Design a protein around this motif. Structure first.
Motif, PDB file in Angstrom:
ATOM      1  N   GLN A  37       0.824  -1.202   0.000  1.00 26.81           N
ATOM      2  CA  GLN A  37       0.000   0.000   0.000  1.00 26.81           C
ATOM      3  C   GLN A  37       0.863   1.259   0.000  1.00 26.81           C
ATOM      4  O   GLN A  37       1.701   1.453   0.884  1.00 26.81           O
ATOM      5  CB  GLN A  37      -0.966   0.019   1.190  1.00 26.81           C
ATOM      6  CG  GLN A  37      -1.964   1.182   1.078  1.00 26.81           C
ATOM      7  CD  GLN A  37      -2.903   1.296   2.259  1.00 26.81           C
ATOM      8  OE1 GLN A  37      -2.521   1.042   3.395  1.00 26.81           O
ATOM      9  NE2 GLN A  37      -4.154   1.685   1.986  1.00 26.81           N
ATOM     10  N   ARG A  44      -2.862  -3.495  -2.537  1.00 23.64           N
ATOM     11  CA  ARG A  44      -2.702  -4.294  -3.750  1.00 23.64           C
ATOM     12  C   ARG A  44      -2.111  -5.645  -3.376  1.00 23.64           C
ATOM     13  O   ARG A  44      -1.084  -5.704  -2.698  1.00 23.64           O
ATOM     14  CB  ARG A  44      -1.797  -3.585  -4.773  1.00 23.64           C
ATOM     15  CG  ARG A  44      -1.267  -4.527  -5.875  1.00 23.64           C
ATOM     16  CD  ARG A  44      -0.697  -3.788  -7.095  1.00 23.64           C
ATOM     17  NE  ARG A  44      -1.693  -2.970  -7.800  1.00 23.64           N
ATOM     18  CZ  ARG A  44      -2.575  -3.432  -8.686  1.00 23.64           C
ATOM     19  NH1 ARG A  44      -2.624  -4.728  -8.994  1.00 23.64           N
ATOM     20  NH2 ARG A  44      -3.424  -2.589  -9.263  1.00 23.64           N
TER      21      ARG A  44
ATOM     22  N   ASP B 110      -5.961  -9.103  -9.161  1.00 25.35           N
ATOM     23  CA  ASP B 110      -6.483  -8.403  -7.996  1.00 25.35           C
ATOM     24  C   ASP B 110      -7.109  -7.068  -8.381  1.00 25.35           C
ATOM     25  O   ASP B 110      -6.533  -6.308  -9.169  1.00 25.35           O
ATOM     26  CB  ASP B 110      -5.362  -8.169  -6.988  1.00 25.35           C
ATOM     27  CG  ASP B 110      -5.877  -7.652  -5.656  1.00 25.35           C
ATOM     28  OD1 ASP B 110      -6.816  -8.272  -5.101  1.00 25.35           O
ATOM     29  OD2 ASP B 110      -5.317  -6.651  -5.161  1.00 25.35           O
ATOM     30  N   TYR B 111      -8.278  -6.769  -7.795  1.00 26.11           N
ATOM     31  CA  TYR B 111      -8.992  -5.524  -8.074  1.00 26.11           C
ATOM     32  C   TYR B 111      -9.627  -4.956  -6.811  1.00 26.11           C
ATOM     33  O   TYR B 111     -10.272  -5.689  -6.048  1.00 26.11           O
ATOM     34  CB  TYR B 111     -10.091  -5.719  -9.135  1.00 26.11           C
ATOM     35  CG  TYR B 111      -9.561  -5.995 -10.530  1.00 26.11           C
ATOM     36  CD1 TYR B 111      -9.024  -4.974 -11.311  1.00 26.11           C
ATOM     37  CD2 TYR B 111      -9.586  -7.279 -11.055  1.00 26.11           C
ATOM     38  CE1 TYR B 111      -8.527  -5.232 -12.591  1.00 26.11           C
ATOM     39  CE2 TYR B 111      -9.094  -7.545 -12.328  1.00 26.11           C
ATOM     40  CZ  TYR B 111      -8.567  -6.515 -13.086  1.00 26.11           C
ATOM     41  OH  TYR B 111      -8.088  -6.769 -14.350  1.00 26.11           O
ATOM     42  N   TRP B 112      -9.481  -3.634  -6.635  1.00 28.05           N
ATOM     43  CA  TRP B 112      -9.995  -2.885  -5.488  1.00 28.05           C
ATOM     44  C   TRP B 112     -10.767  -1.664  -5.961  1.00 28.05           C
ATOM     45  O   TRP B 112     -10.442  -1.061  -6.993  1.00 28.05           O
ATOM     46  CB  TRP B 112      -8.850  -2.405  -4.553  1.00 28.05           C
ATOM     47  CG  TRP B 112      -8.236  -3.498  -3.762  1.00 28.05           C
ATOM     48  CD1 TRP B 112      -7.507  -4.550  -4.247  1.00 28.05           C
ATOM     49  CD2 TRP B 112      -8.299  -3.670  -2.338  1.00 28.05           C
ATOM     50  NE1 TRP B 112      -7.106  -5.359  -3.208  1.00 28.05           N
ATOM     51  CE2 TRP B 112      -7.582  -4.842  -2.027  1.00 28.05           C
ATOM     52  CE3 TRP B 112      -8.882  -2.932  -1.293  1.00 28.05           C
ATOM     53  CZ2 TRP B 112      -7.437  -5.308  -0.712  1.00 28.05           C
ATOM     54  CZ3 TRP B 112      -8.734  -3.387   0.010  1.00 28.05           C
ATOM     55  CH2 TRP B 112      -8.027  -4.572   0.290  1.00 28.05           C
TER      56      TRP B 112
END
Lengths: 212, 224
Positions: A37, A44, B110-112
């Motif tokens: 981060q 991530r 990965d996704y945020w």
């Protein structure tokens, strides 16, 4: 309720070096995940199930460990790798994160440039006095700021704020703000900020006399 | 392209509720669970819970004691997180994230979401007062001096600060806001300049607090 303890709290290294980050679980878990981060960004995923690289993650990141002890290793550090790193377990509910390791850039020692600012007459009219002590562009992060008012040590009436490590010169800057009522402020004469830092052979004191 | 887009910043009084949306696109909504994580300012990460987008199954962090409810709308590919009976310690950035399954044939992608700031406070909207951090009149032929402005007693976040309408940027430090005991925020912005031109160069800090529609330009110069 599984506690994850990361170490070290801060890791200071230069580009091209190798970073080793540790995560200790309070009880055994089957695997460990790792997240990166940067300030102002979402976390991530980097490593999942202890050793697997998420899509697009460069090969210089690798993870290992078993039981209660896990490690994230980052070889040949690039400037984009300096960030906060969190481990996460998902073997027991509720899922929990470590407290984080900050990986910051090591550079040569840089002494702060120190300035003191008296309260403005405009603010005084409103009934409060803010005195500011500024420490510009120093490294390492550790710094002590001590306020004295007529040689009385001030405790609990100041707040500090620190910038993120500068992307260009890798330094920190810090403000410390002492807040007094106007009533208290006008009862005293000498306002002083004393700064202790590795780059200063002896502490630097900036001061002013109220009304001078 | 996969996107998780959250609703905008919220400001709430203690005792109220907040409902944050997480709008998914670019993949099959019902194929992945969604989970939520929050981060209080300057603190670490806290897992809140997770929702199965196909059948509405959920699991939560029991520390929230039934204050968290996650829902989903397949017609709109949106997941919602409602946090009820808010307290000041719920002030945090709230993130939604696409879950992953570690046993897949390929690397996890990965996704945020971008995060949603929720501020919980009894304070009322208030624009800042802007005070000068005046440089010493003391000058030298080639030395430097610091000056700045103190942006005090505003609510909620954020404020923006520039110098000379954006023309002065190098060596500017705008510090993170601190939350005062009064429930109001304060910050300083400073810049280092030559001491020899303090009488003839103008230094203006441009402060904008959009929540109160407050815009202030403050000139900073040596006193007396």
């Amino acid at each position: 309720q599984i506690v994850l303890t990361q170490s070290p709290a801060t890791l200071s290294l230069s580009p091209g070096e190798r970073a080793t980050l540790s995560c200790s679980a309070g009880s055994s878990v089957n695997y460990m995940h790792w997240f990166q981060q940067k300030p102002g960004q979402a976390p991530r995923l980097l490593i999942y199930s202890t050793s697997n690289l998420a899509s697009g993650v460069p090969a210089r990141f690798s993870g290992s460990g078993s039981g209660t002890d896990y490690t994230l290793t980052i070889s040949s550090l690039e400037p984009e790798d300096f960030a906060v790193y969190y481990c996460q377990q998902r073997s027991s509910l509720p899922f929990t994160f470590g407290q984080g390791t900050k990986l910051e850039i090591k550079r040569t020692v840089a002494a702060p440039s120190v300035f003191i600012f008296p309260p403005s007459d405009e603010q005084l009219k409103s009934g409060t006095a803010s005195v500011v002590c500024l420490l510009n562009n120093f490294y390492p992060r550790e710094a002590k700021v001590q306020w004295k008012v007529d040689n009385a040590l001030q405790s609990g009436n100041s707040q500090e704020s620190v910038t993120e490590q500068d992307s260009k010169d890798s330094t920190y800057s810090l403000s410390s703000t002492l807040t007094l009522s106007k009533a208290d402020y006008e009862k005293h004469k000498v306002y002083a900020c004393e700064v202790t830092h590795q780059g200063l052979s002896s502490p630097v004191t900036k001061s002013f006399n109220r009304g001078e | 392209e996969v996107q998780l887009v959250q609703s905008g910043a919220e400001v709430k009084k203690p005792g109220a509720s907040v409902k944050v949306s997480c709008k998914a696109s670019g993949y099959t909504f019902t194929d992945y669970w969604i989970y939520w994580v929050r981060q209080a300012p300057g603190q670490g990460l806290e897992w809140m819970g997770t929702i199965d987008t196909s059948d509405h199954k959920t699991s939560y962090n029991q520390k929230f004691r039934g204050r968290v409810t996650m829902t989903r709308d397949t017609s709109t590919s949106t997941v919602y997180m409602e946090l009820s009976s808010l307290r000041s310690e719920d002030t945090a950035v709230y993130y939604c994230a696409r879950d992953f399954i570690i046993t897949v044939n390929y690397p996890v992608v990965d996704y945020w979401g971008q995060g949603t700031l929720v501020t919980v406070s009894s304070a009322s909207t208030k624009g800042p007062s802007v005070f000068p951090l005046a440089p010493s009149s003391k000058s030298t032929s080639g030395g430097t001096a610091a000056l700045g402005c103190l942006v005090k007693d505003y609510f909620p976040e954020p404020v923006t600060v520039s110098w000379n309408s954006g023309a002065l940027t190098s060596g500017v430090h705008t510090f993170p806001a601190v939350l005062q005991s009064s429930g109001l925020y304060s910050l300083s912005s400073v810049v280092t300049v030559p001491s020899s031109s303090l009488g003839t160069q103008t230094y203006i800090c441009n402060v904008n607090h959009k929540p109160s529609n407050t815009k202030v330009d403050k000139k900073v110069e040596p006193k007396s």
